[model samples]
Target: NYKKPKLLYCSNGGHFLRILPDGTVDGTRDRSDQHIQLQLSAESAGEVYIKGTETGQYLAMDTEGLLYGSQTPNEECLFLERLEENHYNTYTSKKHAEKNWFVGLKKNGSCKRGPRTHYGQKAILFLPLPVSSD
Candidate 1:
């Protein structure tokens, strides 16, 4: 469903994940912010590229679990988008699945480092929903 942007709301902070124009990644509670609207493109094998439409950067994770926005798509830029047992979604590094690295949004809308996160941590629970408009 790459036809329109989507909003990824994190359960941990009760906020939506946002990619700033400068390629910074964080969370926000502002429903009308364009930073919260993201373009997710599907890859082969059920993976996806989470992108910031404003900056045209891909949401990527480093080996240290630090999340960043990159202009180029690489191995670390891909994520395995999985629907969890609770109907929430979890995005883990396609390159580091063995380490169980997950995209995390902590309370207060901060981005949690990847190595410091795991599945079922609520910090990694994301609810993907459609945005209002382009």
Candidate 2:
């Protein structure tokens, strides 16, 4: 059975934070069976950020973010995985990469989280593409 995941929002800076199964930022603690869900407020405008817990892979999306997994926001869906050292790539689209708006994962513990979790496992930092600004 597949479980759905949830995303929390911090409207102050248009940040989309992930909420794990244990209600924390630790994806390691999150149920392996459950997928993540992201619900952006209408106020949210710009690209989204995503990161992996184990692999450190990341992807970024915009208002046009698409879901490639069965779940709306498939947490298990990764861009790329590394079976060896220093060799890695994510499942990001060429378009996104060209624009430098792809998502990336960070191991730091700065993002916010719920009671069980103090920091966010994945963070969605919205950064406008250069083309958009121009």
Candidate 3:
């Protein structure tokens, strides 16, 4: 729920992104990435945001479409929560829309065919994981 009073921490094996302290988001699939733990918060207006438990920074996307942990609030900090087919939430930046964009991975780390090569399930925007065991 990014739930009220208590923060929500999560992890998934499939796709998305992760929140980092150094102001960077990592590709999904880092088991050591705080075991997919991040503090999530939401607003009544449907605005959602995340905070890095390690750094106490808010997750935000810059004008460059890059993700980072921000100390203060920014317009980019707002998100629109959406439900995924799997009953899990998928997050897309309010600034940008990427069906597969997410917060994921090992602070301990997955992928994109992007020119640079990288990715995270970093959202509840406008959407909002898997925790499967073998």
Candidate 4:
């Protein structure tokens, strides 16, 4: 009941997080199960783990405000997840809270650097949608 698979739809690009062939995490357009499906596990009500079902990698962030796919779940992959008052969810780096690093996307379905994002920015807002797994 705690773990569920879903797709993170970005409010800015209407895209979802997709794992690149090179193990880089990026945004994708349309609905394709390839990298669109993600498994979200929570250890606390305020945090979440984002794993790509296809790539078998966890979404990770670096100190340079970049997004990548990590083969293992580490502290760097923990996201301080929250739902905004307007309903969309925002994901910030749990390990680097002071940096205010947010998981965000650009208007062209590209990954936006964490440092460039903010809670109030539409680019940082995402809606989680469940996959049917059909």
Q: Write the per-residue lDDT of candidate 1 for residues 56-133, one digit (tens) a residue.
A: 888999878888899998998999999988888999988888989999998978888888897679899999899765
Model 2 alpha-carbon drift over 4 Å, by segment: 1-33, 36-60, 63-85, 108-134
Model 3, residue 43: displacement in angstroms?
A: 1.7
Report RMSD (Å) for each prediction in the order shown: 1.6, 15.7, 7.0, 1.6
Q: Which candidate order results from sorting by lDDT in descending order? A: 1, 4, 3, 2
| Poorest lDDT segment (10 consecutive residues) of candidate 4 | 1-10
Candidate 1 achieves a global lDDT of 0.86
On TM-score, the candidate that comes out on top is: 4
Residue-level lDDT for 117 in candidate 2: 20
Prediction 2 global C-alpha lDDT: 0.29
lDDT of 3 by residue, 15-129 (tens): 3355555676654443455523555677655567766655667777665555677888677776556665645554456655453333333233332212221233332321133
TM-score, candidate 2, is 0.25
Structure candidate 2, residue pairs in collision: 5-35, 5-37, 25-121, 58-103, 59-103, 60-102, 60-103, 79-90, 79-91
Worst 10-residue lDDT window, candidate 1: 1-10
Write the residue-wise lDDT of candidate 4 on 1-134 in tens digits. Answer: 34557899988867887876577877878787477788888878889889888878999999888889999999999999888988889999998889899999898887889888876898899898887746
Best by lDDT: 1
On the 0 to 100 scale, the lDDT of residue 79 in model 1 is 98
Off by over 4 Å in 1: none
**What are the runs in model 3 whose C-alpha is more than 4 Å off?**
1-16, 95-134
